[PDB]
Amino acid sequence: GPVRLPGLAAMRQGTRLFTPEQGEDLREALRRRRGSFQTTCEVTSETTFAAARRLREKASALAALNFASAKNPEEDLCRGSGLYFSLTSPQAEPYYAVNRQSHSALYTDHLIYSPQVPIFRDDAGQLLPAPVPVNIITAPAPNAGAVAQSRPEQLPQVLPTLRERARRVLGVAAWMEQTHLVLGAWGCGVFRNDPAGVARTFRELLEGEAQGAFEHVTFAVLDNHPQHPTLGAFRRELESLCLP
C-alpha cells in the first residue's frame, strides 16, 4: 500500500482542539506553572520558523504561535511545513465551523494544538536536509481592521478580546507543558492590530499570571522596514522582560 510518510499520522492524530469552555482549566494549568522559572525573554529579527529551528536543539517542549486565519486552515505557518495536515484533522473542525458561524470579526476562543509539525523548508523556500519538528498553537487574533469597517461598536472590545485570547494561548502552552515559546506580532499587519499594544498585552501576562511559567520566550519579529517600527515597538515594550 501507500508509503507511510514519517510523523504525519502521529501529528494529525495528536492534534488537540481547545474550546472556549476549557478557559478555566487552562487558567489553572497556567497558575500551577507560574513561578517555576527565571524566564529568559528576547525580541529577535527572525521569522517564526527560523527562531523555532534555532531553539529546537535547546529544547524539545518548544511551541510556536501561528498567526492564523479564523475561517480557513498573507502567509501563516502552513507555508514550509506540514501544519495543514494537522489543521484539517477531524477533531479540529469545530474551530473552523464555529468561527464561521460566529459572524464576528472578533472570532472565538478556540485554539488548535499541533504536536511535532515538520518544518520542511527554510525562509527562502529551500528544502531542509532534515525536517525540524515543532509544536504549534493556532489561534486567530481579533481582526481589528474588519471590526473597524463592519462592526465599529465592537472596536472597543478588540483589546479585551486580544488579552483574553493571549491568556488562552499561554494557558494551552502550560497545559501541554511547553517550556519554550516563539511569539511575535500576532494580528499585526493585515488584521491591523497595533504592535505596541500586542507587545504590551503579552507583557501584562508575562509579568503577571504567566510570570515564570515558561523557561524561555522568543518574540520573533522579522522587520526590514527602514525604521523597524514593529520590531522596535516590541523591543521598547518588552525591555524589562529582556534584561539578562
Numbering used by the authors: 27 to 99, 111 to 281
Sentences from the paper on this structure:
Despite the abundance of PARP1, most of the PAR generated by DNA damage is rapidly degraded, with a half-life of less than 1 min by poly (ADP-ribose) glycohydrolase (PARG). The radio-resistant bacterium D. radiodurans encodes a PARG homolog, DrPARG, whose expression is upregulated after radiation damage, so it might play an important role in DNA repair. Our study demonstrates that DrPARG is involved in catalyzing the breakdown of endogenous PAR and DNA repair in D. radiodurans. From observing the structural peculiarities of DrPARG, we show that although previously thought to be an obligate exo-glycohydrolase, bacterial PARG could exert both exo- and endo-glycohydrolase functions.
To determine the mechanistic basis of DrPARG-mediated ADP-ribose modification, we here solve crystal structures of DrPARG in the absence and presence of ADP-ribose. The crystal structure of DrPARG at 1.54 Å resolution reveals a typical macrodomain folding consisting of a seven-stranded β-sheet sandwiched between nine α-helices. Eleven residues (GGGFLGGAQAQ) from position 100 to 110 in the apo-form structure of DrPARG, belonging to the catalytic loop of glycohydrolase, that were not well defined in the electron density maps were omitted. The crystal structure of the space group P212121 of DrPARG contains one molecule per asymmetric unit. Upon ADP-ribose binding, as compared with the apo-form structure, that of DrPARG changes significantly. The missing 11 residues (100GGGFLGGAQAQ110) from the catalytic loop of the apo-form structure could be defined as a loop region in the ADP-ribose-bound form. As compared with the apo-form structure, the bound form structure of DrPARG showed additional secondary structures: a short β-strand (denoted β4′) following β4, extension of β5, and an α-helix (denoted α4′) preceding α4. Consistent with the thermal denaturation study, structural analysis showed that in the bound form structure, the induced α4′ helix formed more intra-molecular hydrogen bonds, especially with residues from the loop connecting β3 and α4′, whereas the equivalent region of the apo-form structure formed fewer hydrogen bonds with surrounding residues. The presence of inducible secondary structures observed from the comparison of apo- and bound-form structures confirms that conformational changes occur during ADP-ribose binding to DrPARG.
